Design an enzyme around this catalytic site. Structure first.
Site, short mmCIF file in Angstrom:
data_model
loop_
_atom_site.label_atom_id
_atom_site.label_comp_id
_atom_site.label_asym_id
_atom_site.label_seq_id
_atom_site.Cartn_x
_atom_site.Cartn_y
_atom_site.Cartn_z
N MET A 411 0.80 -1.22 0.00
CA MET A 411 0.00 0.00 0.00
C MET A 411 0.84 1.28 0.00
O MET A 411 0.33 2.33 -0.41
CB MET A 411 -0.95 -0.01 1.20
CG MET A 411 -1.92 -1.19 1.21
SD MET A 411 -1.25 -2.69 1.98
CE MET A 411 -1.24 -2.21 3.72
N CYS A 468 0.65 -5.39 13.28
CA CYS A 468 -0.18 -5.72 14.44
C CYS A 468 -0.62 -4.47 15.20
O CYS A 468 -0.79 -4.50 16.42
CB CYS A 468 0.57 -6.66 15.37
SG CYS A 468 0.83 -8.30 14.66
N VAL A 822 12.63 -7.79 5.28
CA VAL A 822 13.29 -9.01 5.76
C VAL A 822 14.65 -9.12 5.10
O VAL A 822 14.75 -8.98 3.87
CB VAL A 822 12.42 -10.24 5.44
CG1 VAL A 822 13.15 -11.52 5.82
CG2 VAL A 822 11.04 -10.16 6.11
C1 LIG Z 1 12.79 5.19 24.89
C2 LIG Z 1 12.11 5.98 23.69
C3 LIG Z 1 10.56 5.90 23.73
C4 LIG Z 1 9.86 5.07 22.83
C5 LIG Z 1 10.57 4.26 21.87
N1 LIG Z 1 11.10 3.63 21.10
C6 LIG Z 1 8.47 5.01 22.88
S1 LIG Z 1 7.66 3.94 21.75
C7 LIG Z 1 5.89 4.17 22.21
C8 LIG Z 1 5.06 3.48 21.11
C9 LIG Z 1 4.36 4.24 20.15
C10 LIG Z 1 3.63 3.60 19.15
C11 LIG Z 1 3.58 2.19 19.10
C12 LIG Z 1 2.78 1.47 18.00
N2 LIG Z 1 1.47 1.00 18.45
C13 LIG Z 1 1.00 -0.21 18.12
O1 LIG Z 1 1.65 -0.94 17.43
C14 LIG Z 1 -0.43 -0.64 18.63
N3 LIG Z 1 -0.42 -1.85 19.44
C15 LIG Z 1 4.27 1.44 20.06
C16 LIG Z 1 5.01 2.08 21.06
N4 LIG Z 1 7.73 5.72 23.75
C17 LIG Z 1 8.40 6.53 24.61
N5 LIG Z 1 7.63 7.25 25.49
C18 LIG Z 1 6.28 6.69 25.74
C19 LIG Z 1 5.22 7.03 24.66
C20 LIG Z 1 5.31 8.48 24.17
N6 LIG Z 1 5.37 9.53 25.18
C21 LIG Z 1 4.18 9.43 26.02
C22 LIG Z 1 6.57 9.46 26.02
C23 LIG Z 1 7.75 8.71 25.38
C24 LIG Z 1 9.79 6.65 24.63
C25 LIG Z 1 10.47 7.49 25.58
N7 LIG Z 1 11.11 8.12 26.27
#
Ligand SMILES: CCc1c(C#N)c(SCc2ccc(CNC(=O)CN)cc2)nc(N2CCCN(C)CC2)c1C#N
Ligand SMILES: CCc1c(C#N)c(SCc2ccc(CNC(=O)CN)cc2)nc(N2CCCN(C)CC2)c1C#N
Ligand SMILES: CCc1c(C#N)c(SCc2ccc(CNC(=O)CN)cc2)nc(N2CCCN(C)CC2)c1C#N
Ligand SMILES: [Zn+2]
Ligand SMILES: [Zn+2]
Length: 842
Positions: A411, A468, A822
């Site tokens: 996509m 996912c 991959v």
């Molecule tokens: C260590 C770096 C970091 C990181 C990194 N790397 C991440 S990632 C978070 C994340 C975002 C989107 C997805 C995708 N969502 C799906 O797939 C649905 N299930 C997964 C994880 N967050 C972080 N915080 C928490 C979330 C954002 N603020 C509130 C503060 C910063 C931080 C930090 N400091």
DNA sequence: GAGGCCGCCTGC
DNA sequence: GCAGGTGGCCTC
């Protein structure tokens, strides 16, 4: 009131076998299925097939129970069809009095029209039941989580009346596990020679190559005790005020703990010591081997490995005697000049292949011609690649020789264009896969671009990696997130599998696919495949073990149609850092592993950052020239492979992001020593390329946890360093060479290890990211020597892409294409396992 | 559109 | 506690 029916079929020792027995109002014969009472009344009934019936002079009336496995006891757990059973190799003798009742168990065999019988909706795939009596369709391996078609083991006329297939298969397994000697060559003074021996189903003859553990023998070139690294010599704490945060002795991406690859020998003798009476003691099998040198085993040591083919060896006349039980596998070692083909064709033509052109004389530290006594098609599958990206998985499958990707679904348009550039014969759909499948199911032949839609029978292999989004947490499903999963692209991909029913199916994903939502995403995916009637399994692979200088674990789900063989996971090819090779998976307290047996060593040395990119010309931060000179020939085996046979006069996409002046100054002050990162930055003023000034960082608050520097300076940069005090905005500092935010929050982020971190020549890449950012989570993106982040070409090399593999769009699009793919070497290893199944199909 | 800024969970 | 594993979104 247990009465035998008829006369005894056979009398053996203290046992008299019977074909039929009467218990109360019922009659049982061999082959009937029964339920059996457990000790825990709360636990369900056991179910078994009766394989024999006999009266015992010491045990009374007896039968042999070949147990079924309840679906809930498999990895499927509670998702299983409540009446589905699985065949397993579990069985035992039992008294007839333990039988509770006779039960009907049906074998639900796939029909001859199975490949046309798909099209059930997602609810039916996820939750639908057979709705009948007990049934089985598949056999189950509880340690590897493999569902396979039932074994076709056959009985003779000496066992037909009492034949237990589980007993037979267990006996075959036990015999396969025991080393044996077969032939017999000569009888010497104190030992007996043998021509062949077998171990783990592998035949070894005199003259074959053997893999041995690195401890099996030493070389006459002993070693050189290296000058070890000292204990972190003191630094100027005023000049380097964040160096104290490096108190851990662990370096990201270091190959200091990778094991040695296998010793390699040529079997000279297979022999057993003689007993006192002259007979051989065949429980004690030895082999005498000639030692092969790897280049790095000679006096030239590790640098000799840099330019050498990864499968080049040196013959020697040194010999070693080792236990046969130490053999780790067989390998092919050939003198290169006697091959009927060039070395490259030989090396690409099969697994475990080594060659030598010279012999090594350790005494003289010189090389010589080897002695005379050292001398002595399949049609590709039409493949549909869903969520293909720029095509790394398809490229590796193509290299394996198993597939032609005629259709791809992507996509994101730059990736789709890249896939087209590399696959001119393929049809690339950019639509939502749900829309495409709905059109096909409605009987459409072409989409709205005039592209021909694949129909049932066109698609012989299906592969992809579905995102996912929305259910990648570890916590349990609820109503909302389960609804998201049911409407998700994972389930859409499973729907493609159900409709097209290809011969082989592959789902790849991030490692935590096996753990999302308390492993329910994994369990439901497997449940759907089994519900379709597929053979299937899962596992975790480390890409670095298949020939890239990169740590990248992937979850892999494999499925194979009825009539096919279910593939094995590929054995590791390269040694790799053990901390990055944790492949086991726990589901509902059960630890699962794959069939992989190479856990400690492997045939080839680890591929390094040096292997990956030492040949690329120096470029600056922000390099944008799309076509440049390589400035030199390929240096390593890996570079020779990726540049390819045809001369390439132009290097493409060796371009880097244009980092800002402050970021560039920071990169210019990261030391070159391994393990260097932001914590090594000096606290100085520096004039920037745009005339502005980068400032010293000032330490304004006392950090009780981190203490003070040796000059008494503070270590906090914000009031939040206190227990409950909030952040003071006035305390935020700007444009400091040492970034303010890293000491600001380092105490709760492992001191932000690796940010502004340099790769090391001897080490490996962290997981190749889609957008290299020095202050992002995956911040170890600086070149080992140049003051810049890694280029698109360097990221492509970390993924194992050929240099000729075309990318499309701006620099950020190209980085994302590379980072999402991959690695083709991983995809190729998986594809070769599938090729083994194609060739072995009965 | 860059780069500054930085949470929550898990295995050991 | 240490290390890994998931990136996004202000601000301008
Ligand atoms: C260590 C770096 C970091 C990181 C990194 N790397 C991440 S990632 C978070 C994340 C975002 C989107 C997805 C995708 N969502 C799906 O797939 C649905 N299930 C997964 C994880 N967050 C972080 N915080 C928490 C979330 C954002 N603020 C509130 C503060 C910063 C931080 C930090 N400091
Ligand atoms: C998937 C592993 C497994 C499988 C598989 N495969 C099976 S097979 C069914 C079966 C096998 C053997 C016997 C004989 N009795 C004993 O083995 C106890 N001494 C009875 C039934 N059962 C399992 N359950 C239920 C049977 C009784 N417990 C062992 C509890 C575990 C489990 C589990 N987790
Ligand atoms: C509470 C969250 C949730 C979770 C969580 N957590 C799960 S777990 C997946 C699962 C659990 C048990 C079975 C057994 N049922 C059978 O029918 C066997 N063939 C199958 C799948 N499923 C869920 N729904 C919803 C309706 C009930 N149905 C089971 C369909 C699945 C839901 C929901 N809302
Ligand atoms: Zn048995
Ligand atoms: Zn603060």
């Amino acid at each position: 009131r247990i009465s035998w029916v008829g006369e005894a079929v056979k009398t053996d020792g203290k046992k008299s076998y019977y074909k039929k027995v009467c218990i109360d109002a019922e009659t049982l014969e061999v082959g009937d299925c029964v339920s059996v009472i457990p000790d825990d009344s709360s636990k369900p009934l056991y179910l078994a097939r009766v394989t024999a019936l006999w009266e015992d002079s010491s045990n009374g009336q007896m039968f042999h129970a070949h147990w079924f496995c309840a679906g809930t006891d498999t990895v499927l757990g509670a998702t299983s069809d409540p009446l589905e059973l699985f065949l397993v190799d579990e069985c035992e003798d039992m008294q007839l009095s333990y039988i509770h009742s006779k039960v009907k168990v049906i074998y639900k065999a796939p029909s001859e029209n199975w490949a046309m019988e798909g099209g059930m909706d997602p609810e039916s795939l996820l939750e639908g039941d057979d709705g009948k009596t007990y049934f089985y369709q598949l056999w189950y391996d509880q340690d590897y989580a493999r569902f396979e078609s039932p074994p076709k083991t056959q009985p003779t006329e000496d066992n037909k009346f009492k034949f237990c297939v589980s007993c037979a298969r267990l006996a075959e397994m036990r015999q396969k596990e025991i080393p044996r000697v077969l032939e017999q060559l000569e009888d010497l003074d104190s030992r007996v020679l043998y021509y062949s021996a077998t171990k783990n189903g592998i035949l070894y003859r005199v003259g074959d190559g053997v893999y041995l553990p690195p401890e099996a023998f030493t070389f006459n070139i002993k070693l050189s005790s290296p000058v070890k690294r000292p204990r972190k010599e003191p630094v100027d704490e005023d000049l380097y005020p964040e160096h104290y945060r490096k108190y851990s002795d662990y370096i990201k991406g270091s190959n200091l703990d990778a094991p040695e690859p296998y010793r390699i020998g040529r079997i000279k003798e297979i022999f057993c010591p003689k007993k006192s009476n002259g007979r051989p003691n065949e429980t004690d099998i030895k082999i005498r081997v000639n030692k092969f040198y790897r280049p790095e085993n000679t006096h030239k040591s590790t640098p000799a490995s840099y330019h050498a083919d990864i499968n080049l060896l040196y013959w020697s006349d040194e010999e070693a005697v080792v236990d046969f039980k130490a053999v780790q596998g067989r390998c092919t070692v050939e003198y290169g000049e006697d091959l009927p083909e060039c070395v490259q064709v030989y090396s690409m033509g099969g697994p475990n292949r080594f060659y030598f052109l010279e012999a090594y004389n350790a005494k003289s530290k010189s090389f010589e011609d080897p002695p005379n006594h050292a001398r002595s098609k399949l049609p590709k599958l039409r493949t549909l690649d869903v969520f293909s990206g720029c095509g790394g998985l398809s490229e590796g499958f193509h290299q394996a020789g198993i597939s032609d990707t005629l259709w791809a679904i992507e996509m994101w348009d730059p990736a789709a264009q890249a896939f087209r550039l590399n696959n001119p014969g393929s049809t690339v759909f950019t639509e939502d896969c749900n829309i495409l499948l709905k059109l096909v199911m409605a009987g459409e032949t072409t989409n709205s671009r005039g592209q021909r839609l694949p129909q049932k029978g066109d698609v012989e292999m299906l592969c992809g990696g579905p995102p996912c989004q929305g259910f990648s947490g570890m916590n349990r499903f609820n109503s909302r997130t389960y609804s998201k999963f049911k409407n998700s692209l994972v389930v859409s991909f499973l729907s493609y599998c159900d409709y097209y029913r290809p011969r082989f199916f592959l789902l790849e994903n991030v490692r935590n696919f096996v753990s999302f939502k308390r492993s329910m995403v994994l369990k439901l995916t497997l449940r759907c495949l089994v519900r379709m009637g597929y053979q299937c399994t899962f596992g975790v692979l480390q890409a670095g073990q298949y020939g890239v200088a990169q740590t990248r674990r992937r979850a892999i789900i494999l499925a194979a149609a009825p009539g096919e063989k279910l593939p094995l996971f590929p054995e590791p090819l390269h040694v790799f850092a053990p901390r990055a090779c944790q492949l086991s998976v726990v589901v509902d307290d059960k630890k699962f592993v794959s069939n992989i047996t190479r856990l400690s060593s492997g045939p080839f040395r680890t591929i390094t950052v040096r292997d990956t990119m030492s040949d690329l010309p120096e470029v600056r931060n922000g390099a944008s020239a799309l076509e440049i000179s390589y400035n030199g020939e390929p240096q390593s085996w890996f570079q020779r492979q990726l540049r390819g046979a045809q001369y390439q006069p132009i290097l493409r996409d060796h371009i880097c992001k244009d980092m800002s002046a402050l970021v560039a100054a920071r990169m210019r002050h990261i030391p070159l020593a391994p393990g260097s990162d932001w914590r090594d930055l000096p606290n100085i003023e520096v004039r920037l390329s745009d005339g502005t000034m980068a400032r010293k960082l000032r330490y304004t608050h006392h950090d009780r946890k981190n203490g003070r520097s040796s000059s008494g300076a503070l270590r906090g940069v914000c009031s939040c360093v206190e227990a409950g005090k909030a952040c003071d905005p006035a305390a935020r500092q700007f444009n400091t060479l040492i970034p303010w935010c890293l000491p600001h929050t380092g105490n709760r982020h492992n001191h932000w290890a690796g940010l502004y971190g340099r790769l090391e020549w001897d080490g490996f890449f962290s997981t190749t990211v889609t957008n290299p950012e020095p202050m992002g989570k995956q911040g170890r993106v600086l070149h080992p020597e140049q003051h810049r982040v890694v280029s698109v070409r360097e990221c492509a090399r970390s993924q194992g892409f050929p240099d000729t593999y075309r990318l499309f769009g701006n620099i950020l699009d190209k980085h994302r294409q590379v980072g999402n793919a991959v690695p083709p070497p991983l995809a190729k290893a998986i594809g070769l396992e599938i090729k083994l199944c194609m060739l072995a199909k009965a």
